[PDB]
Amino acid sequence: RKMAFPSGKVEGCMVQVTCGTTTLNGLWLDDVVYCPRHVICTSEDMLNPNYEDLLIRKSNHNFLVQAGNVQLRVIGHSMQNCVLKLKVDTANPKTPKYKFVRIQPGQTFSVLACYNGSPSGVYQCAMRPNFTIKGSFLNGSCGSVGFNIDYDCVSFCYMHHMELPTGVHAGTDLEGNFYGPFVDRQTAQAAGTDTTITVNVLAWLYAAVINGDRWFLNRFTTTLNDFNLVAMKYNYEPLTQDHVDILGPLSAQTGIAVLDMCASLKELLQNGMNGRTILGSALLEDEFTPFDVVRQ
Amino acid sequence: FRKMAFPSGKVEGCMVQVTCGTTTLNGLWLDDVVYCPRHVICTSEDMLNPNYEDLLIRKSNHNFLVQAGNVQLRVIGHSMQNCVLKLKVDTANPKTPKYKFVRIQPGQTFSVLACYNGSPSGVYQCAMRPNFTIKGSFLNGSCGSVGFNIDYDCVSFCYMHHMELPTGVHAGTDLEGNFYGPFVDRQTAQAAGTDTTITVNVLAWLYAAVINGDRWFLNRFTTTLNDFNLVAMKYNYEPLTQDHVDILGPLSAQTGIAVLDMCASLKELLQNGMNGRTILGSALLEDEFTPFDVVRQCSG
Ligand SMILES: CC(C)(C)[C@H](NC(=O)C(F)(F)F)C(=O)N1C[C@H]2[C@@H]([C@H]1C(=O)N[C@H](C=N)C[C@@H]1CCNC1=O)C2(C)C
Ligand SMILES: CC(C)(C)[C@H](NC(=O)C(F)(F)F)C(=O)N1C[C@H]2[C@@H]([C@H]1C(=O)N[C@H](C=N)C[C@@H]1CCNC1=O)C2(C)C
């Protein structure tokens, strides 16, 4: 299964941030609360916000930060790209070992969706090639974060900011830089055409072989360029030599050369599943990374 | 629309490691009791045809090693309830949540916190299948992992993991040690029965599709429970009951599609398939969202 990481280490960091009439989630790590800067916007500000001007007018006491039933005293504030950093009185005693990481398209992570500072649910997802997330976010969900956990260290990679017209989601890393060409402004924008994460589909096919299914293999191989010429006709991402190298261990462990697995994928695209499933799915799964495969 | 699990933090603080001889699995630590599958008291060879009464008599407190992180918990008593072992320990879990033990029905969903060596590994959302199995993801050492729901700070534990059947699906007990399904904790040939699709959940998921603006499958027709159930039996779908209809009532009122109107859509989808089209991006009809699940996610 696509699994999320256990969310407890992040649940202990979620807080509520309110400025005027607008309330969203904040991330409380040590003595800083991170949250999307449009918390300082009213409704008349969303179309063309001047964030420098909106922020200079705020005092510390304009920011109401609540961690459960406890109010946290804001003692300083600062804007870093599209994220606000609220310095508070108190270091979060539940701060886990953590770091901030900016991820690349195709990378997976877990999302803890929150409202009013309290967690609602957790799910796994991927950063799409068009720098969006196929998330599940409602009003008040901004400031929810995405993360991985490695040896009890939480790497925060995503903070939620907005929803695009096709229902997909856009946000920033924890230094406030958007993924993709989006802005925290309620102006017309749209995700680029989204493609399938080819390297993840192939890793998942290798996972199927490791799991003992081989029905989709064939006797063909392919050059890299012929594979990409075919796959791009199905809106699959081009497979780079770096992707080929990445799959090397899985290729060695199964004895199926990467370009031979590429030939199998070409045939699967041409034929479909003919009523079969692969690892319990009737679709070609692309939100499972080569790293994820080895780690499960 | 995402398959979302509950936040797992309240449960993570209850997972411990239980070892009896060579056999190690996970245990659930609530106040001063650790709950785990009773087959922990088995050697590999015992598991082929165990006599649990006798194997438990021969054991003492000193046969059990319980580890909560870096800390050993001393076992001061032991007993069995059905297929669950209960280890009384010298220290009450200071992270014990408000909780209840509940037994769920086929078609109900829950989150699983997958654990190995007492350490939580991942969380995912599951349904109790009509054939009482669960389509989980469980490896060696996963026994004792639990499934749960949360309602307002109270964790309702409903599943504890015991075994994997030859089709790769899974069987376990409630926290009182009562099996779900006709399975026994013995390493002997057993198999999942033929499964069916959870009709009330497919309907809930069609309401979620409508809520999300996916409306092409709606049609002008209505049907009856009797007529729908005749086509349901044909396609290996759980018969739809009057309880299912009232349970769907709120979704029916939020969307303006009467429940019997939606059943006609599902009927049509079941016979003619899809014209290649998708619903919520899905090629198949999804049945692991309950009506409550759809309301929670669509309302936050
Ligand atoms: C969807 C809406 C048309 C309203 C708008 N979108 C676009 O303007 C775009 F289309 F350009 F993206 C949009 O998301 N916002 C408008 C305003 C913030 C953001 C916003 O309300 N964020 C919410 C945080 N709590 C999460 C949203 C709520 C609905 N579902 C979500 O995930 C900012 C971009 C500054
Ligand atoms: C799969 C195996 C053929 C080994 C066997 N299955 C059947 O005997 C069945 F077919 F009858 F079910 C089986 O699961 N067990 C045999 C033995 C316990 C159980 C068991 O090892 N449980 C594991 C607990 N850590 C979790 C398993 C590990 C693999 N994936 C899992 O989920 C008991 C039934 C007493």
According to the 3-state scheme, what is the secondary structure of A136-202?
A: CCCCCCCCCEEEEEECCEEEEEEEEEEECCCCCEEEECCCCCECCCCCCCCCCCCCCCCCECHHHHH
* Rounded Cα distance, A36 and A145, in Å: 11
Query: What does residue A71 show for φ and ψ, rounded to 5 degrees?
Result: -85, 135
Active site residue B39: yes
SS3 A93: coil
CB A3 within 8 Å of CB A124: yes
Q: How was this structure determined?
A: X-ray
* Rounded Cα distance, B120 and B114, in Å: 6
Q: For residue B2, give the nearest of A12, A123, A140 by CB distance.
A: A123
Sort residue B35 into left (φ over 0), alpha (ψ -120 to 50) or beta. Answer: beta
Sign for the pseudo-dihedral over CA of A40, A42, A47, A52: negative
**Residue A3 and residue B113: Cβ atoms within 8 Å?**
no
Sign for the pseudo-dihedral over CA of A121, A126, A127, A133: negative
Task: Calculate the alpha carbon distances from B294 to A23, A279, B207, B261, B299 in Å.
Answer: 24, 25, 8, 18, 8
* Rounded Cα distance, A171 and A160, in Å: 5
CB A24 within 8 Å of CB A17: yes
Query: What does residue A52 show for φ and ψ, rounded to 5 degrees?
Result: -60, -40
Any CB–CB contact under 8 A between B273 and chain A? Answer: no
* Rounded Cα distance, A18 and B159, in Å: 39
CB B67 within 8 Å of CB B20: no
Q: Which long-range contacts (CB under 8 A, 24 or more apart) does B234-239 make?
A: B235/B197, B235/B270, B236/B194, B236/B195, B236/B196, B236/B197, B237/B196, B237/B197, B237/B199, B237/B202, B237/B270, B238/B106, B238/B107, B238/B130, B238/B196, B238/B197, B238/B198, B238/B199, B238/B200, B239/B199
List the structure tokens of A19: 């400025």
SS3 A69: coil
* Residues of A in Cβ contact (< 8 Å) with B122: 1, 3-6
Any CB–CB contact under 8 A between B117 and chain A? Answer: no
Amino acid found at A20: G
Q: Which of A154, A9, A155 minimizes the C-alpha distance to B10?
A: A9
Tell me the residue length of chain B.
Answer: 300
* Rounded Cα distance, B137 and B151, in Å: 24
Q: Which of B157, B159, B168, B162 minimizes the C-alpha distance to B184?
A: B162
* Residues of B in Cβ contact (< 8 Å) with A137: none
Helices B259-272, B199-211: inter-axial angle, 10-degree rounding? 100
Q: Are strands B98-101 and B154-164 parallel, antiparallel or unpaired?
A: parallel
Nearest ligand 1 atom to alpha carbon A38: 35
Q: Which of B125, B150, B146 minimizes the C-alpha distance to B135?
A: B125
Question: Residue A77 forms beta bridges with which residues?
Answer: A86
Per residue, the 3-state secondary structure of B14-82, as one string, reads: CEEEEEECCEEEEEEEECCEEEEEHHHHCCCCHHHCCCHHHHHHCCCHHHEEEEECCEEECEEEEEEEC
Question: Residue B150 forms beta bridges with which residues?
Answer: B155
Task: Calculate the alpha carbon distances from B42 to A71, B45, B64, B75, B160 in Å.
Answer: 52, 8, 12, 18, 18
* Rounded Cα distance, B115 and B141, in Å: 8
What DSSP character marks residue A61? Answer: G
Cβ count near A193 (within 10 Å): 8
- Deposited resolution, Å: 1.9
**A152 contacts: CB under 8 Å, gap ≥ 6:** A9, A96, A97
List the structure tokens of B145: 């992992």
Alpha helices in chain A (DSSP H): 8-11, 51-56, 198-210, 224-231, 241-246, 248-254, 258-271, 290-294
* Rounded Cα distance, B300 and B292, in Å: 12
Active site residue A169: no
**Residue B123 and residue A167: Cβ atoms within 8 Å?**
no
What DSSP character marks residue A5? Answer: P
* Rounded Cα distance, A95 and A27, in Å: 10
List the structure tokens of B21: 């001889």
* Rounded Cα distance, B109 and B87, in Å: 28
What DSSP character marks residue B275? Answer: S
Query: What does residue A164 show for φ and ψ, rounded to 5 degrees?
Result: -90, 165
Interrupted after residues, chain A (C–N over 2.5 Å): none
Any CB–CB contact under 8 A between A24 and chain B? Answer: no
Cβ count near A269 (within 10 Å): 16
**A235 contacts: CB under 8 Å, gap ≥ 6:** A193, A194, A195, A196
Token pair 């006599």: residue: B51
Burial class (CB in 10 A: 0-12, 13-18, 19+), B27: buried
Query: What does residue A153 show for φ and ψ, rounded to 5 degrees?
Result: -105, 125
What DSSP character marks residue A95? Answer: P
Q: What is the dihedral of CA A24, A27, A28, A29, to 10 degrees?
A: -170
Instruction: Identify the nearest ligand to the CA of A164 by its number.
Output: 1
Helices A224-231, A258-271: inter-axial angle, 10-degree rounding? 30
Amino acid found at B217: F
Task: Calculate the alpha carbon distances from A265 to A232, A255, A279, B61, B171 in Å.
Answer: 12, 16, 15, 55, 34
Tell me the residue length of chain A.
Answer: 296
Q: For residue A1, give the nearest of B13, B120, B124 by CB distance.
A: B124
* Rounded Cα distance, B218 and B14, in Å: 46
**Residue B5 and residue A1: Cβ atoms within 8 Å?**
no
Amino acid found at A252: A
Residues 278-297 of chain B whose Cβ lies under 8 A from any Cβ of chain A: 282-284, 296-297
